[PDB]
Design a protein around this nucleic acid. Structure first.
Ligand SMILES: [Mg+2]
Ligand SMILES: [Mg+2]
Ligand SMILES: [Mg+2]
Ligand SMILES: [Mg+2]
Length: 150
RNA sequence: UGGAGAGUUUGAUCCUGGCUCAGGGUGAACGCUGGCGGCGUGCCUAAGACAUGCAAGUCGUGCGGGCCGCGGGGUU
């Protein structure tokens, strides 16, 4: 068990003679607040069920966010298709400035002091997906020179 | 020591893309309302037209006299 906050939920739909069937979507984040988080997307015939599946995959796929002072190691940019995200580390006592998507994800990941910018396609879903791969690719002075051994 | 976005093309999706909004600002004006003070600020329009008053003068230690009001006899 971790935190588990719910990003957004939508009602989609398809066609079929007679009318339109349906489906709901659940994009969800999860994190103790120690440097561990997981994003999960859940589709299901009903609101609650979907929100459930959310957390399930959420916990399934999670990442080691190497914090530091409560901020972040280095500044990075990542593009996920059409949606691009900028993560830039702030000094203690700043705030977590971001949209609902990147902020939510960033809170449970721990961070308290981070500068963020949401460029490109601002597709909620895709921003999330983007935010993760960002963290995923975070390095510390350690694992840095850990590769420049030889 | 510094960086948040959202609504809106579709049965739904993703993308592109414009329109729209929340902010801050002003020698402001307009509506409704209106108690006190301090500090600022107040014809952005017709460089249109203007009554009245004032905004530029001063030195008798540069010089000669006019009027007014002071004191003082050279030829008897
Ligand atoms: Mg691209
Ligand atoms: Mg069309
Ligand atoms: Mg419609
Ligand atoms: Mg003028």
């Amino acid at each position: 068990d971790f935190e588990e906050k719910m990003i957004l939920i939508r009602r989609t739909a398809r066609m079929q003679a007679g009318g339109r069937r349906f489906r709901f979507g659940a994009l969800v984040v999860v994190g103790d607040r120690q440097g561990r988080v997981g994003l999960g997307f859940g589709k299901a015939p009903e609101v609650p069920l979907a929100v459930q599946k959310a957390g399930y995959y959420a916990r399934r796929n999670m990442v080691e966010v190497p914090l530091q002072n409560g901020t972040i190691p280095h500044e990075i940019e990542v593009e996920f298709g059409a949606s691009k995200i900028v993560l830039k580390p702030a000094a203690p006592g700043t705030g977590v400035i971001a949209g609902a998507v990147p902020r939510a994800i960033l809170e449970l990941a721990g961070v308290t002091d981070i500068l963020t910018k949401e460029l490109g396609s601002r597709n909620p879903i895709n921003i999330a997906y983007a935010t993760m791969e960002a963290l995923r690719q975070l390095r510390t002075k350690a694992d840095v020179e850990r590769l420049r051994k030889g």
